[PDB]
Amino acid sequence: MGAIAKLVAKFGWPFIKKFYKQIMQFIGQGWTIDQIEKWLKRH
Question: Which domain holds residue 16?
Answer without folding.
Answer: 2-43
